[PDB]
């Protein structure tokens, strides 16, 4: 006869996304309720046991199971703890927590990436034959001022109660290798306003202005200017890298910077080719590629 | 009579040098052995007391003196602890530690600076009339792949047991002011490979290339190019500063950057002087005099 | 008497936070240790679970729980939930979650194409192999199917060893040590496309100085080129990990400096060493300079 545990998680804040570590900080409360043997509470009213006093009750025989956050990176910061002991036997454990959680996160679509913040809960020592999760309730807020927030929570929390089967387990008692696991998922979308106006938009103007090399009259002017253009992209790649999050792969912005290098480099080849490959004689159509070069770039841009 | 304490320190790692704080991280073990009153150990075999249980023995009367790292910056991170109690009375305290230590460090010769990592041990409450250090043994591991390490441990650890006569000793009165101190010194030399090839070498090419301004024909070309040169040194001073450690003084690389500024600025004055005082034959052809003059001043920077 | 046989099982959940300069890395996982001690009279002769705070209370009352130290851990690790499963026959199963910063000799000279092995060294803190011995070790790494998005690619199931460490400066000098090795390869995608590829274009574009007509144009452009390499050397240094040696990218940057500097000296040599008469071969080194660079590049 497994002990049924009702869980309720209150999410107060989701912040501190670490791109490289694939982590995110979560502040909130955790409430767990189960029914035990009836007790003789003072005045037959629910008894409150806070923090340090909890340990004293455990030493005296009170059963308080350890519920572990499967995906937490290191011991979470547990604030105030509380046990509400009812005379009928039901026990309510309430505690504040702040933890750094892990999940597989893909930032390839940055700054237009969509992530899901997950919380995985499971008893640390009791299998589903001893302790089971009966239900889960997740309570997020309703962010009305999303514009100020870095992340936009879209839709209420998702929940999943399942059974995790470990193949390499200690005991061999047939069918006692399964643990009840709560899984919470909160979908969110990055606020791309800042990256669109301060990174994408200026980069577009830099790349577009780089096409103006073809409007210059002299070959010496066309070639020398392209080096100032090349230096502008390097100056921008640096401005980008110093602010953008570190990742083991390229993002949308990174690819634009690579495209910028390609465009300038391709123009350098065209500038030299037009001035040295002729009968004597700058090619008419290739130097007047002032319209063909941007369209060729936009075509490759759309394919990407 | 003074309790003789035999100490053994095992250094596992020396890293995390903080230039501005003059601090460095040291991971290792500390072993202290002394002889007390004989004990009745279970089955007359040495008794092992680990971590939490050590405090229980102290509460019951076991004398475990506190040994302080004089030069540690804040309480060190103590790992596993143990007490080995022998029936004959000898006690062996062993503990893992990671602490941030301080020492006077001079980085003026960077990236060719040589430092010595020091550990200073001393009893926290007992003078040399109560507790004395009999001997010290320091064990440093070999740098198997020295080419990979940031620091190269040169000298096998130096050790010395001295007696520090503390001045302001509250209520000690006759002679409770001489304390036995263990001092460990580990000499090390910085690996300059990276700084030579990625900082010194390119800087040399930048400064040398700046001298080619005298090979330009027109005054307008000589002066305008020198501004691109000036901007190159600024860009390089920035590339240097962002990577090099922060210090309250200039290093070898910093002086080279200053010399770069001076060379370009001096050339700007020469370029203007030649053109406004028909270009001077010798001044415009200082293509050989300017580099040699710089190299001559460069030799004084070393000596 | 005989040594207490301890069966260990390590579960690796995450390997991250590689510190290049410190040669350290963070490891999150579980550690399971099983041994047989003196039998107990467990309630109802069924296995007894002892969690966290209660573990220390059992130790105070006589339960023998030996301290197992991570030899190569940098500072005390962060221990999460702890558990003791006490059987009536005498079996003891210790299980704990841990997060620690571990050290190992790491060579990043081949960056961004370097291959490393993350090691874990376990050993009893006070009991030698005559008192406590490791009977077996089993390491469980999780298969990463979404390996494209990870910084490191764990290449191969963990290697395991059980050796005996002899301590000279202390016949009770030998300790049982478990050694775990996890081989990994860096994901070079980002560095290839955003750091190697653009640099290649910058170094190649520097060769177009010879395609300029005037000596004044060839020399002045070379300073804009030299400034471009400095600007790139900076975009690289700010992102790339700090090391006491040069990497592949660093050497490319040095080569860039050399190429531009050599071109400056060739541009001056061609214009001032003659019978204004630019040497026909020297100024037409538009093909000789890139091939000469590629030849040195192969070395």
């Amino acid at each position, epitope marked *: 006869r497994p002990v049924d545990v009702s869980v309720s998680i209150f999410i107060n804040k989701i912040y501190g996304v670490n791109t490289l570590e694939q982590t995110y900080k979560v502040d909130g409360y955790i409430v767990a309720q189960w029914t035990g043997k009836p007790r003789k509470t003072p005045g037959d009213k629910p008894l409150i046991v806070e923090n340090t006093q909890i340990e004293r009750w455990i*030493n*005296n*025989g009170l059963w308080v199971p350890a519920l572990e956050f499967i995906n937490v990176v290191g011991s979470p910061d547990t604030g105030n703890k509380r046990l509400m002991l009812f005379p009928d036997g039901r026990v309510i454990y309430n505690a504040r927590f702040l933890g750094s959680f892990s999940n597989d996160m893909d930032f390839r679509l940055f700054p237009f990436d969509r992530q899901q913040f997950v919380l995985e809960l499971e008893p640390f020592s009791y299998n589903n034959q001893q302790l089971r999760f009966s239900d889960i309730q997740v309570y997020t807020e309703n962010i009305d001022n999303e514009e100020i927030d870095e992340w936009w929570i879209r839709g209420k929390a998702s929940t999943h109660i399942s059974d995790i089967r470990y193949d390499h387990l200690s005991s061999v008692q047939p069918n006692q290798n399964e643990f009840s696991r709560i899984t919470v998922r909160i979908d969110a979308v990055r606020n791309p306003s800042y990256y669109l106006w301060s990174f994408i938009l200026p980069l577009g103007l830099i790349i577009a202005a780089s096409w103006s090399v073809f409007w210059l009259e002299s070959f010496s002017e066309r070639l020398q200017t392209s080096f100032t253009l090349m230096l502008t992209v390097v100056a921008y790649a640096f401005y980008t890298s110093n602010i953008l999050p570190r990742l083991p792969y390229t993002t949308v912005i990174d690819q634009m910077i690579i495209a910028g290098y390609g465009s300038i480099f391709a123009a350098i080849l065209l500038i030299i080719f037009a001035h040295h490959r002729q009968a004597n004689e700058d090619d008419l159509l290739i130097q007047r590629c002032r319209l063909a070069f941007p369209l060729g770039f936009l075509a490759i841009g759309c394919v990407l | 009579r003074p309790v003789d304490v035999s100490v053994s320190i095992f250094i596992n790692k020396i890293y995390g040098v903080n230039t501005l704080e003059q601090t460095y991280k040291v991971d290792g073990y500390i072993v202290a052995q002394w002889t007390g009153k004989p004990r009745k150990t279970p089955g007359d075999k040495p008794l092992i007391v680990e971590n939490t249980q050590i405090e*229980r023995w102290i*509460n*019951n009367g076991l004398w475990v003196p506190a040994l302080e790292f004089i030069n540690v910056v804040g309480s060190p991170d103590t790992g596993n602890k143990r007490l080995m109690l022998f029936p004959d009375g000898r006690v062996i305290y062993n503990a893992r530690f990671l602490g941030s230590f301080s020492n006077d460090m001079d980085f003026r010769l960077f990236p060719f600076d040589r430092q010595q990592f020091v550990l200073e041990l001393e009893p926290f409450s007992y003078n040399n009339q109560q507790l004395r250090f009999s001997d010290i043994q320091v064990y440093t591991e070999n740098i198997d792949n020295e080419e990979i390490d940031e620091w190269w441990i040169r000298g096998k650890a130096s050790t010395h047991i001295s007696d520090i006569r503390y001045d302001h000793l509250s209520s000690v009165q006759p002679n409770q002011n001489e304390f036995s101190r263990i001092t460990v010194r580990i000499d090390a030399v910085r690996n300059p490979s990276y700084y030579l090839w990625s900082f010194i070498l390119p800087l040399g090419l930048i400064i040398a290339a700046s001298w080619s301004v005298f090979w330009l024909e027109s005054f307008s070309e000589r002066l305008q190019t020198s501004f691109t040169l000036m901007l190159t040194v600024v860009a390089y001073a920035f590339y240097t500063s962002n990577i090099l450690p922060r210090l309250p003084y200039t290093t070898v690389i910093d002086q080279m950057i200053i010399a770069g500024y001076g060379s370009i600025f001096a050339a700007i004055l020469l370029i203007i002087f030649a053109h406004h005082r028909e270009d001077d034959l010798l001044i415009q052809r200082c293509r050989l005099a300017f580099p040699l003059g710089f190299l001559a001043i460069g030799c004084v920077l070393v000596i | 008497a005989r040594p207490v046989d301890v069966s260990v099982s390590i579960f690796i959940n995450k390997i991250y936070g590689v510190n290049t300069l410190e040669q350290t890395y963070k490891v999150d996982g579980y550690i399971v240790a099983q041994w047989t001690g003196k039998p*107990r*009279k*467990t*309630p109802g002769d069924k296995p*007894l679970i002892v969690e966290n705070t209660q573990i220390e*209370r*059992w130790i*105070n*009352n*006589g*339960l023998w729980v030996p301290a197992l130290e991570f030899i190569n851990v940098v500072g005390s690790p962060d221990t999460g939930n702890k558990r003791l499963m*006490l059987f009536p026959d005498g079996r003891v199963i210790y299980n704990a979650r841990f997060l620690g910063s571990f050290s190992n000799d790491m060579d990043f000279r081949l960056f961004p194409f370097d291959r490393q092995q993350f090691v874990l060294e376990l050993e009893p803190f006070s009991y030698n192999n005559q008192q406590l011995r490791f009977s077996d070790i089993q390491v469980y790494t999780e298969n990463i199917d979404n390996e494209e998005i990870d910084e490191w690619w764990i290449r191969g199931k963990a290697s395991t060893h059980i050796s005996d460490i002899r301590y000279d400066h202390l016949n009770q000098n030998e300790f049982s040590r478990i050694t775990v090795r996890i081989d990994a390869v860096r994901n070079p995608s980002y560095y290839l496309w955003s750091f190697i590829l653009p640099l290649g274009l910058i170094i190649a574009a520097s060769w177009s100085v010879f395609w300029l007509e005037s000596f004044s144009e060839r020399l002045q452009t070379s300073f804009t080129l030299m400034l471009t390499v400095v600007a790139y050397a900076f975009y690289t240094s700010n992102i790339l990990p700090r090391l006491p040696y040069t990497t592949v990218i660093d050497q490319m940057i040095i080569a860039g400096y050399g190429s531009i500097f050599a071109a400056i000296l060739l541009i001056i040599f061609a214009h001032h060493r003659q019978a204004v008469e630019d040497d026909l071969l020297i100024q037409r080194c538009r093909l000789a300079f890139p091939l000469g660079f590629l030849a040195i590049g192969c070395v």
Partner: nanobody
Amino acid sequence: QVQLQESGGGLVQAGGSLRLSCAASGFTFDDYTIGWFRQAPGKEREGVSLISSSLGSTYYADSVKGRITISRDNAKNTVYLQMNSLKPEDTAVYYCAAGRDADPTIFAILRSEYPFDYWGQGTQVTVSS
């Protein structure tokens, strides 16, 4: 210094009763878990009964349950071990131990003797007929 002065032992006729006393001195009595032990000739010392004040725990050996009652009195800093309906098997040296971190609940499982910092000299209790 810690002194666990025991009294109330000696010779007893089979089936009789005896009340042991352990006068605790040299330590804060209440924050300890005083108890009683016994060691018959050529047999390992066993645990009899242990009473802790901090907890509401009380251990009773199976060989003595139903004929023993342990009690505390902090007013006099003493522990009384009353054994009724004695047997010749009860003959042993009765030691009085006192530990700080000793839990009577855990002791019933471990039967360790490790958390007892201070021990008594022992009082001989002989039962015959």
